Ligand binder design. Structure first.
Ligand SMILES: CCCCCCCC/C=C\CCCCCCCC(=O)O[C@@H](COC(=O)CCCCCCCCCCCCCCCCC)COP(=O)(O)OCCN
Ligand SMILES: CCCCCCCC/C=C\CCCCCCCC(=O)O[C@@H](COC(=O)CCCCCCCCCCCCCCCCC)COP(=O)(O)OCCN
Ligand SMILES: *[C@@H]1O[C@H](CO)[C@@H](O[C@@H]2O[C@H](CO)[C@@H](O)[C@H](O)[C@H]2NC(C)=O)[C@H](O)[C@H]1NC(C)=O
Ligand SMILES: *[C@@H]1O[C@H](CO)[C@@H](O[C@@H]2O[C@H](CO)[C@@H](O)[C@H](O)[C@H]2NC(C)=O)[C@H](O)[C@H]1NC(C)=O
Ligand SMILES: C[C@H](NC[C@H](O)CP(=O)(O)Cc1ccccc1)c1ccc(Cl)c(Cl)c1
Ligand SMILES: C[C@H](NC[C@H](O)CP(=O)(O)Cc1ccccc1)c1ccc(Cl)c(Cl)c1
Ligand SMILES: CC(=O)N[C@@H]1[C@@H](O)[C@H](O)[C@@H](CO)O[C@H]1O
Ligand SMILES: CC(=O)N[C@@H]1[C@@H](O)[C@H](O)[C@@H](CO)O[C@H]1O
Ligand SMILES: *[C@@H]1O[C@H](CO)[C@@H](O)[C@H](O)[C@H]1NC(C)=O
Ligand SMILES: *[C@@H]1O[C@H](CO)[C@@H](O)[C@H](O)[C@H]1NC(C)=O
Ligand SMILES: [Mg+2]
Ligand SMILES: [Mg+2]
Lengths: 663, 664
């Protein structure tokens, strides 16, 4: 005779998860297969005492104590629902019992302080998370947003996920759990601009949140969505009275969302401990269901029950000492615990290895929605990092997005059609100045050319030419210069402007000063002006010299955000030096024009109109430029136009008539 | 004899909430007081069968069934913790038992589908939320924030709070879930700008999150913090290993945080069903505790046990039929249920009424931290809406902040000192023009003044005067005008400028053409210019007239957020018409200066020519400037006004000063 052995079991034949329909037949098949074998428990015989629980802890504790405070005496319990398993595991160390939940996937059952006798063949839900991070590091996403329904599972899953992301060079950006309304969740996902979402919720919360993401147009090539694989295929094509949207409005919202689930069946065909395979066990089972698989609940979680009872039989074989087990002996349970901890074998679900938490690790699966059809992608094992991709992820732009918009620092440059025009004009001006200088030099014998002070009109021409040349450097801002030779340009601007204007006005101003005092000493002042200019410029460049500075405008650009930067070479006390120099030159302009109005009565009376014109131009242009600093292509426009027009006018005024009369 | 009646109970003497230490003595006192009375249950006698539970659902179901599958037969259960109460209350309909919890504050127990036999003398935690809304609506806060520890309570409290805020003219603006360490919670409260926070967490979580709110400088006059008042007084002055901060860095971070907590004791002195009061019941109890109250556990939740057993005895007196109670009869339990829901009486804890969810309502007492001291504030009742202020809320800014930063619309105006100086200058210019006109009119016979066309110099002066007048409308942007007269100004600007510049430059240019003929025919062109100007201006005002347009710049200048506005008036095609007009007038300027350069040899000719050249260069360098500086006041107007005034001054002096200097 065989010493009978009993095991309590609680099978949910109804409720949120009806997984007893397909997991009672599996347990019975496994009992038959383990008792037919005469090498496992030949001295004993396993027997089952089933009770319904409805995945309800009220129906559950009643039957638990009906099967606990009654004979026969049990050696183990098998609760499937997370709630019943949680209650049973917590309230078993008080009876010295082992609990072997074949269908509970609550991370809270991985704790050994409350659940010191708990083992399960059903992987936890945290086991999606080793995958997600090992799916972010691939695509390198460090900024993440998470949303979670309020359930007894998803509350711990994101905790595990944060703990696992911290140690993965990744961080979270947004998280908000909705009890019943996901709208403000999506509203903040749109406000915070989270392009990567991790959606933990059941089918109904899904159909309720996707009819909100569509309403918020928060999908497409700039948004990714992770979910769970448990949702039945073709779940968005189902009535959703609370979802005001429609099939066509959702199928586009859930287009290309990733889905990490677990695999509860060895895709291999290699035999197992029971000399059976998956394709064979599925048939042997479906031959025992009064209903069909699609109508039989818990059909994907039957192999877990099979493997659980098989692991029980094994870990009970090593022990082999059981007919004398009472609810007060904390030693038989410890023997069975050390036998179950060391439980390694290949069952229908795969290789079962119970971690220290009691749970078992398994192979994660990954899918992606590709036109109303789920398309497997890859597998991942949190044990050996063995990631088996399949190159089937069809994104929108051939590659996946990233955390956030990239702020590219763009530089603003002149139109580059204005620069060419101003430069052509300045070159023509230099040509004209040289032509006039030559016509004057060659005119060293004529009277009108002899009377007109030529040694000062030549200086006027030289200064006008220098100023004209100052045009090209005024536009070099990166399109044609580098950060190394850039101070060269920012210094050439200053020196050319300074010296050119100094001479161009000193000649024509000493001429009027002489005309005044007189109605070869002119060279004295004609040189003293340039000397004061050189001295003040050197003092400026010694005290506060020019150096490159980048000015950043308001960041915006119509998936990158281009923040514009202007390359302005400016000193620290710049404005002060500019104001000082402009004030000195303005005093000088005003004195020159006053002396011109006073001394109106050779070739010195015409220079007065030129003086006044240059004066008004510079006076109206300097402050303009000082104000238009924040604008390129306009400040330079006025500066270059003022320079070139002053030059053209001065030259054609006080050099042209000479030839017009001498020609 | 008396037919004994038994009561199963589960008292937590250890765990997160050790509330059996002070609730077993209270139970026993209640049983003594309810059996010493011969007018409640004279045929019966209540007896207790207790078991410790440690607020542990493992140590709890063991004893539950040691007292369920054993004799004697129990008629009711009394669990204290919320885990234990959630475990029992769902495993009682299976035995047809009544569950009467004196210490469970979980909203999940206000459900009749899982817990149809459950009553509790301990109010739920949702009972804080009717207060909070009745404390937001007052201070007008439609945008709030939340964070929640991970517990079996706070998860449902914010659910109730959303359900109750939606239906009260309120809307949430943030939420999160501090599980292990609050770091992103506060960071997003700073980023999302949550100035109103509702933090539900246990003391450990508090001391852990406040050493982060400080580190983030997320407190002050612009932030308000709501909490629960269950934390013991002077709880921030305690060691905090993970909280690198200290009392000095926390006492300032928890300054002025509201702590709405329930009141478990009648502050009144009125007697109760037991002919006892609060100041007396507390003494009688403390005379039964081997430890000190502050050191004893569950000392504030004993009155609830007393009231619970009294309610049980009352609702069991009406029923009076109990010595034959089996676990399979679903009728005695229904009698006791209809007797318990109809239970109203004044006990130590107050008025003991049981809502449809089994729970009871009560009085929430508000508190606020004022210098390391909790300062009571008005109570509240979710039923009567009765709020009883004490007027002790000491805010920082003499008043409480609001949800966000009020965005004000700012109208930028001219310096208003520039305007005065420039107006003075334009007025002096008009005075000068009038003086010169009067002189030119008086000396109309002298050849020195008979040569210069006076019928045209008068027009030049009239135009200069009009242009000078155009300076005043150019600075009226609201500081001196309203939205009604503002188009009048945006029309006067146009007409004065146009007509004055016409009568000036057209007149001088026709005079130049006339003197060119040498190298009433002039009146013809001097009038045709102004006529074409009037025609084109009327076309513009009839097709695309000027209307006030506002320019909005980026918000800046920092709790008021200043939204800057620019009072402009430019038509839709304003740029097009302006460019057309400026191009035409520039062509005319160039033609005039060319005719002058050609007529430089052929009275008042060179003066007119120099004036033409100056006015031309000034207008040419000034118009596009003012067109680019549209987005800048005090600069565009500055250039425009200085140009107009200098053009007027010069065009007047150049050709009227020599006249008088020679005629003197
Ligand atoms: C009244 C006139 C006062 C000045 C008279 C003398 C002129 C120049 C001497 C001082 C020049 C300092 C320039 C330093 C660099 C700088 O900040 O340069 C300025 C730009 O240039 C100016 O502001 C100078 C304009 C001067 C125009 C004067 C009128 C024309 C006179 C021509 C006369 C010629 C014939 C004479 C007879 C700021 O660039 P930034 O940071 O945006 O970077 C480059 C951005 N593209
Ligand atoms: C080249 C020719 C240039 C001169 C054209 C003069 C004739 C007509 C100009 C018509 C301008 C219409 C302006 C409508 C209102 C408006 O928005 O006008 C604009 C633009 O103003 C201008 O552009 C005025 C330019 C006048 C100065 C240049 C010419 C001086 C000639 C002086 C001659 C005097 C006599 C000589 C003898 C500014 O306001 P807003 O949006 O910032 O708001 C109010 C802010 N406070
Ligand atoms: C497991 O099943 C396989 C196939 O059903 C068994 O392999 C057969 O064993 C029989 C012995 O009765 C042989 O006659 C056949 O030739 C085998 N077929 C093949 C394809 O190998 C195997 O023996 C079973 N394992 C056991 C019983 O331990
Ligand atoms: C309730 O208690 C009060 C006082 O605690 C009782 O009133 C006293 O009654 C006694 C009778 O034993 C008198 O001697 C005292 O003079 C009363 N004192 C006061 C202040 O009234 C009252 O009788 C009690 N009610 C009951 C027992 O029903
Ligand atoms: C893989 C997992 N197996 C079943 C859990 O193990 C039962 P649970 O109690 O842990 C969570 C639970 C789930 C549904 C309804 C109530 C509860 C699972 C999860 C969701 C679904 Cl839809 C399916 Cl088909 C399968
Ligand atoms: C008013 C309430 N009285 C006790 C609850 O009624 C027991 P609970 O189980 O419902 C929640 C619970 C509380 C603490 C530790 C574990 C659990 C209460 C709430 C918070 C605190 Cl910190 C305290 Cl001291 C007291
Ligand atoms: C073979 C094996 O892994 N045995 C484990 C042991 O390592 C671990 O210390 C113990 C803790 O429960 O569980 C058992
Ligand atoms: C405290 C209380 O309610 N006592 C009642 C009493 O009023 C009633 O007269 C009697 C008869 O039903 O039962 C008891
Ligand atoms: C059962 O235990 C026996 C030892 O008595 C053994 O040798 C056999 O391999 C066991 N069956 C297994 C491990 O499947
Ligand atoms: C009290 O309970 C009874 C049923 O026993 C029910 O009819 C009644 O509505 C309840 N009272 C309230 C206020 O819900
Ligand atoms: Mg799937
Ligand atoms: Mg308090």
């Amino acid at each position: 005779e065989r010493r009978a052995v009993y095991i309590g079991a609680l099978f949910p034949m109804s409720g949120g998860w009806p997984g007893g329909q397909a997991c009672q037949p599996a347990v019975e098949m496994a009992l038959e297969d383990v008792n037919s074998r005469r090498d496992i428990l030949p001295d004993y015989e396993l027997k089952l005492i089933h009770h319904d629980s409805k995945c309800d802890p009220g129906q559950a504790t009643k039957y638990l104590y009906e099967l606990l405070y009654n004979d026969p005496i049990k050696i183990i319990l098998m609760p499937g629902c997370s709630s019943v398993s949680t209650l049973v595991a917590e309230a078993a160390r008080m009876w010295n019992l082992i609990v072997l939940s074949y269908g509970s996937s609550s991370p809270a059952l991985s704790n050994r302080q409350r659940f010191p006798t708990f083992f399960r063949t059903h992987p936890s839900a945290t086991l999606h998370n080793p995958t997600r991070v090992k799916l972010f590091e691939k695509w390198g996403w460090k900024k993440i947003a998470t949303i979670q329904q309020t359930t007894e599972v998803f509350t711990s899953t994101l905790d595990d996920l944060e703990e696992r992301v911290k140690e993965a060079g990744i961080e979270i950006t947004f998280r908000q759990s909705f009890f019943s309304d996901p709208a403000v969740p999506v509203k903040n996902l749109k406000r915070q601009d989270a392009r990567i979402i991790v959606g933990l919720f059941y089918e109904t919360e899904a159909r309720k949140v996707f009819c909100e993401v569509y309403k918020e147009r928060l999908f497409g090539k700039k948004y990714v969505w992770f979910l769970i694989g448990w949702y039945a295929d073709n779940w968005f094509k189902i009535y959703d009275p609370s979802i005001n949207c429609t099939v066509d409005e959702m199928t586009e919202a859930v287009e290309g969302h990733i889905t990490t689930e677990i695999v509860m069946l060895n895709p291999a065909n290699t035999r197992s401990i029971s000399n059976m395979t998956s394709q064979e066990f599925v048939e042997k089972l479906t031959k025992r269901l009064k209903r069909h698989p699609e109508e039989t609940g818990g059909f994907q979680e039957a192999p877990l029950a099979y493997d659980a009872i098989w692991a029980l039989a094994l870990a009970l074989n090593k022990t082999s000492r059981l007919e004398d087990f009472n609810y007060n002996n904390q030693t038989i349970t410890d023997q069975i615990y050390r036998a179950m901890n060391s439980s390694s074998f290949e069952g229908v679900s795969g290789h079962v290895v119970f971690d220290a938490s009691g749970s078992r690790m398994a192979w994660t699966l990954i899918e992606q929605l590709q036109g109303g059809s789920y398309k497997k992608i890859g597998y991942y094992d949190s044990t050996k990092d063995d990631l088996s991709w399949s190159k089937t992820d069809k994104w929108i732009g051939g590659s996946p997005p990233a955390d956030q918009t990239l702020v590219i620092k763009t530089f603003r440059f002149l139109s580059q059609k204005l620069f060419i025009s101003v430069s052509v004009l300045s070159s023509l001006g230099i040509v004209l100045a040289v032509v006039c200088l030559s016509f004057n030099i060659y005119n060293s014998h004529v009277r009108y050319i002899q009377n007109s002070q030529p040694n000062l009109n030549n200086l006027t021409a030289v200064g006008c030419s220098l100023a004209l040349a100052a045009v090209f450097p005024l536009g070099l801002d990166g399109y044609h210069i580098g950060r190394n030779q850039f101070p060269f340009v920012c210094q050439a601007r200053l020196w050319l402007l300074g010296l050119g204007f100094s001479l161009g006005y000193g000649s024509m101003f000493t001429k009027i000063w002489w005309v005044h005092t007189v109605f070869w000493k002119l060279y004295a002042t004609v040189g003293l002006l340039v000397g004061m200019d050189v001295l003040t410029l050197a003092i400026w460049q010694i005290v506060d010299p020019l150096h490159r500075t980048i000015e950043t405008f308001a960041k915006e650009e119509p998936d990158v955000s281009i923040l514009p930067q202007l390359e302005h070479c400016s000193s620290r006390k710049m404005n002060t030096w500019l104001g000082i120099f402009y004030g000195y030159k303005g005093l000088l302009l005003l004195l020159g024009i006053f002396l011109a109005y006073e001394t109106k009565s050779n070739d010195h009376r015409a220079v007065g109109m030129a003086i006044y014109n240059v004066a008004v131009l510079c006076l109206i242009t300097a402050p303009v430029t000082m104000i238009l600093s924040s604008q390129q292509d306009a400040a330079f426009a006025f500066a270059s136009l003022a320079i070139v027009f002053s030059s053209y006018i001065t030259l054609v005024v006080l050099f042209v008539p000479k030839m017009r009369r001498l020609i």
